[model samples]
Target: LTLTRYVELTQLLNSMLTAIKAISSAVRKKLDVLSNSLVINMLQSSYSTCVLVSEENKDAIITAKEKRGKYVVCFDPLDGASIGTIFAIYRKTSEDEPSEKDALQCGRNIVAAGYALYGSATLVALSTGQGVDLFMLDPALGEFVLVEKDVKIKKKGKIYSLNEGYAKYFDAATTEYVQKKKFPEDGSAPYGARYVGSMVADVHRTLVYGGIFLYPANQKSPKGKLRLLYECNPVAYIIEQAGGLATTGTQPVLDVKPEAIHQRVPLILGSPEDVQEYLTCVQKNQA
Candidate 1:
């Protein structure tokens, strides 16, 4: 919407989704989505928006900043966590290569970004600053179809995701934000818990349902967690196009000028309303 044409961005996304589906079924038990096989095929298309300078995550645990070249496709290639997503998230997965970053890319610089989910069914959801769509793959038939003509995302942020298990480590600002929101919808409550643990899996939900997905700065990743180049930037770009929002609590996630290939930042994205609410809470008392 900003600078790129609608069709091109989404088309590359189509290829990304296609690649993920092709590799997904071949995945065996204990396999990391970032396996060599997945990596090779993840961004097979060049000049395809989000190509080059891919983000490589080995083991899905430690994310060390490194660099590749550009025309960049700043992407995680495949995510690290997954129940289907949770199992992928929690379960151990990695590649022989080391984890590293690509060239610099701001969220706004991204042409398109999306995530695919593999479960009882397979679907890839993406955005381009215009709107969002979901594509489903039929294994039996070996084809992907658009599941919903129109699509939408957020509550119960899980996966690359908020890492619910680490809430205690978050600063009081982030902590307060979580405690105030009630997820895991009660008949009378505000939200419910739903996570596969994989970034693609949970983010797919966030894009569909609309709500904030938080990953903050910590001692280990003081700049913040989620990789800015590929992971956050691409997803943020797509969410905004979907008529949603992206932020780091204080500022728009896309607005930040990337400082490095693997620069990390606090990620807060989702529904327009919930996104605003998150901004309100975090800004209530900023550091």
Candidate 2:
């Protein structure tokens, strides 16, 4: 992609990010409402190649173009809702902790994907199939300044993130792989464990900190939890571009195509070496 096109895509993403910023936390329950409203406003008013926002869900907003273009935009308007819910749960004296459903709906897929973290400082992570870029939203200047460019995962760490709490539900091969990693006989196992319940945060941390993120299918849900078309594919694209690898527990995630829009599949993604190691382990265990 040309520098000019990159700038244009970033500019468009910036506008959407700004619109998301305008939404107050008090009304964050209306996130889907806000996302749909902003998407219509942006696409209709702008003469950009992006023609429409095709899918809008709590997890993401997906935009499409009139013709087959190299890029599209996907946005996770808000994340970490369980943190928000914890605040409410404490005040309400409710025994129920917020579920993953309340955790900003986890991760999402995009033709191009980016997100705004409404935290200490508003941060933006965007990928345009070239490389991932990190930006910080400047409140005083009312602009996003580039903080990191062409971000790539360069380290090899043995940290793995998976919901092993559901171990009894997993297949023999998957269970064996986990058992070996968690209690290696060799004592030379080059891996640790880190399972953040949030998919976006977990994957983001892995991409930066050098680890692997796994959302494999267990007996509870043999097909997997995340949708292939909307969540896995887009993330796979970004992860691969960042010199990482994305796969099912058994195969490359990108190699699978969706027969339907909301198709679910297992996702094992992160540092290339770790993913390859996990794949080898699974293949050997199956053998």
Candidate 3:
């Protein structure tokens, strides 16, 4: 897809972001919320199938050609990325513009996914569907150059990100897993805990820091909060490429073949060893 159609548009998208910043963060932040949205829409309009993350997309799937294509392009566009941070630079050239139609997409529909982190520096982590790569933005040079290629996540790491405020919401295994990690009476599986809350940022930290990111279902978000396409699928794609693993506890996210554009799922992603431990807890609870 990158060779045939996208031509690595994620890298192109990051370059576009840098130019938006060249105008000054002040101007970009002031953009009418829809302004940045239009930017993502236009960039993806050319693709056959596109799943753009809305503040999560009413109609994130868009087709520009007379005939809607079958190949898919997915993006976690305009979340924290659009709301006045450096990520907002997908910043449209025009004020408010039209957006694409929602296609009610699924992971099976997606062939490739990518996202950018606009923290101190702009970086885009992308999966060609087979492998993952990381790129950094060159503001002065006005381009996105590959900084790391075929990046792979470590098989196991010492960190773990878990939230226990809604302790009762999770099954027994999940509870034990968190407690075991936190207390570690035995110490064999004791691990560090960290979470930034922002889904992309949290997953980004996990990708770099190497650990488990658990977004479990709660009474409020019974199906879990993050959309499978825009947030989870793309994130999972990268992790799998880094030789890591991901799951909805019962199934591999990449294998879900979901039913909706904003389909939600319990996402556990990170080192295969850690994810296995999590599933072990799940089995214990089920037992």
Candidate 4:
């Protein structure tokens, strides 16, 4: 695709996100209605593509379109904690926050994959598959400005993020891995644990800073928390390209076949070394 084509794709994403910005959470029902409507419009009008979005309840996947072999666009439309709550939190956090430029780099197979953050500057990341490029919406120009490119993460990091609250629900093996991370023996090396409660934000942090993000099924969540199609797959794709690895705590994440759109599965993704170590721990402890 030409530079002009990339720009056109970016514009399409920006327009769709802008329309959703004016919406308020007071009318909670309208959020889904508006999100679904905008997504349907974008997919139908844009080049041939398949769109998969999570329903309002976050229980199932709703296939908005189906086109054979067309570039698949997986979106969360709004990903974070409660949009109303997080939007407020983001405003008080930082003013010089990095724009989404480097995160939008697209790959060869990716006709396009990126998201728009409705908070603050309305950041958007576009991935042409060449590399993740990030851009921020310039309110004045109403266009995204390229700010960063070829974003990469450090080789190793001391921080690890996962939902450890589900420890009891997980199998012994899964529990064993968490135990090791939480309480390490002397001289084993100490690391910090962080859970952002948001997949995109958590995974984005891992992609940049170098850490592990786990969503493995425990005794409580036998299946998993995140959906295989929308959440896990897309992030897994990007993580692998960024010199990282993604797995279901036991096997490669991409190799899993989807029986249903909302199929839940475990995910452990991050820097190569940390992921390898975590996988080894689980493999040895699997019942």
User: Local error of candidate 4 at 83, Å?
Assistant: 5.8
Instruction: Put down candidate 1 lDDT per residue, 1-287, tens digits, no spaces.
Output: 11112244344454555556655665533354344345444434423322244455432222222321122355555566341211000111233333322234345555445666666676666554457666677666666666664465544233224766776677767666666665423353554545455666566667765556666675555678777666676677667767778887678888888766656788877777767766776777774
Among all candidates shown, the one with the greatest TM-score: 3
Report the lDDT tens digits of candidate 4 across residue range 42-82. Answer: 54465433333343434322233342113334455565533
Write model 2 residue lDDT over 1-287, tens digit each, in one string: 12223464454554555564564233333565665566546533443323231335433222233331222333333333421100000011122432222212222323355544544565556676678886766666656778788889854667889987998898876776777777877877646888767666677677778878888888888899876654566567668868899888776787774454456799988888778777887788678
Compared with the true structure, model 3 gives a TM-score of 0.77
Better of 3 and 4 by lDDT: 3
Q: Over the full model, what C-alpha lDDT does candidate 2 score relative to the true structure?
A: 0.58
TM-score of each: 0.71, 0.72, 0.77, 0.73
Backbone clash tally (model 1): 38
**What lDDT tens digits, residue by residue, belong to model 3 across residues 33-53?**
444555455445434323344
lDDT values for all models: 0.55, 0.58, 0.61, 0.57
Rank order by lDDT, top first? 3, 2, 4, 1
| Displacement of the residue 211 alpha carbon in candidate 4, Å | 0.4
Error of 1 at 101 (Å): 12
With a 3 Å backbone cut-off (N, CA, C), the pairs that clash in candidate 2 are 109-230, 158-191, 158-192, 169-219
Q: Model 4, which residues run further than 4 Å from truth?
A: 1-29, 50-69, 81-111, 118-121, 186-189
**TM-score: the better of candidates 3 and 4:** 3
